[PDB]
């Protein structure tokens, strides 16, 4: 009754708290791919993230890649067969949330429209935190 | 099935805004306005929002209210003599009551709108 919502939130218990956060910058990560009788073979997709579409659980995001001649845009649940997700360059510093404009105008024009976000990178420095002090601190 | 969604409106955009504003100035000026019930009913939430902003009294808020009211003399009165009157009251700084009988003119039901207190 009372929270039409907070009931539904309770069902979403396939949430994740293991994925690096990213936003229209430049990640890359794996999958799951069925074939060959098996549901094995993990395959990596590698691209600029074009748009994250927020909604708590079932927020999706989408990744652009240039496979051979062709552009390819992928779309991802943010949950479930995604084994790992670690990101390439948290660049963008995109002036805007949804950036489909790059579909029409992709090449090096991208690169000099989507320069590095040293700010977010330089806090991934701080996050290096690989001081090997386990069983020692 | 138009309407599964919020905020009544006759007049088009430009002119409806102009109305909420010109009613706001007016309400904040005289403290009592007399209008048709629906107009009154909408004017209610447009002003409460302005009033609230004024209570926080930071430069941003002043600038923020000047978008809709364009008058500094009035905006002042707001921040200095109106918004203090609340400050212990959260939400609902405006009152709307209907009147009996309408206009010999088109028979329109009237309400009045008061600043509360």
């Amino acid at each position: 009754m009372n929270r039409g919502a907070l009931i539904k939130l309770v069902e979403s218990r396939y949430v994740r708290t293991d994925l690096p956060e990213f936003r229209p910058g430049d990640t890359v990560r794996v999958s799951y791919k069925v074939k060959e009788g098996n549901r094995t073979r993990i395959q990596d997709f590698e691209g600029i993230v074009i748009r994250i579409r927020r909604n708590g659980f079932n927020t999706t995001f989408t990744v652009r890649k240039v496979s051979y001649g062709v552009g390819v845009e992928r779309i991802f649940p943010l949950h479930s067969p995604l084994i790992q997700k670690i990101d390439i360059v948290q660049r963008g510093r995109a002036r805007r949330a949804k950036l489909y404009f790059i579909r029409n105008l992709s090449d090096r024009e991208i690169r000099r429209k989507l320069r590095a976000d040293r700010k977010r990178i330089d806090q991934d420095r701080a996050a290096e935190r690989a001081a090997k002090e386990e069983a020692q601190k | 099935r138009h309407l599964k969604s919020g905020r009544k409106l006759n007049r088009h955009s430009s002119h409806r805004l102009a109305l909420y504003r010109n009613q706001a100035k007016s309400l904040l000026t005289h403290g009592r306005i007399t209008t048709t019930v629906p107009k009154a009913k909408e004017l209610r939430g447009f002003v409460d929002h302005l009033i609230h902003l004024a209570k926080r009294g930071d430069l941003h808020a002043r600038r923020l209210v000047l978008r809709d009211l364009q008058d500094v003399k009035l905006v002042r009165k707001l921040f200095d003599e109106i918004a203090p009157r609340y400050r212990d009251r959260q939400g609902g700084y405006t009152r709307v009551l209907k009147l009996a009988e309408r206009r010999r003119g088109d028979g329109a039901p009237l309400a009045l709108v008061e600043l509360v207190e």
């Binding site: 009754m1 039409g4 009931i7 539904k8 069902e11 396939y14 659980f57 649940p77 | -």
Partner: protein
Amino acid sequence: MKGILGVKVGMTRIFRDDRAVPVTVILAGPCPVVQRRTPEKDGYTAVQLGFLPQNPKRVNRPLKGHFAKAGVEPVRILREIRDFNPEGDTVTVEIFKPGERVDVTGTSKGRGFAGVMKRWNFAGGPDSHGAHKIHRHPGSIGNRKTPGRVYKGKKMAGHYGAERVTVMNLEVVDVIPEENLLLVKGAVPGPNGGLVIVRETKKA
């Protein structure tokens, strides 16, 4: 024929095996059986269940404490569930198991005075070439001197939706007893917060 009163809460999807399965959640709060029809006195057999509990004792004429769990009879009233006669003290969701199949009945959204060509998908007139006040219109509706009339049932414009609708054979995907919750294969008549009834299906 199992069955329970319930409320559509709304939908999302979950994952199964390795696939996204859209579901609509239903809250089927426990349903106090407040009358049983017998063939003897009433003619047919069924069970009248009740649903939404709370009530400021607005019980006036239907005081009808009569059955144990008159526990201030439910806001959202009470409905029968045809041929069905169980453990005479409440109906939970334990009733259902995952995998099972069900028919769901509720109230389609109220579309108001619909056009034809929404009410019916009619073709409508051409956006151009031909004159101009007949784009969303229905065309002809008849012949001429014979029959000199319009037939009964003619698909025309009017009040559409806000009507009963039973969609059939939905998978029950999961049952949360703990919360009287219930997941199915998504897309059940009616808006969220809305009343529904939920019965075992007819593929047998």
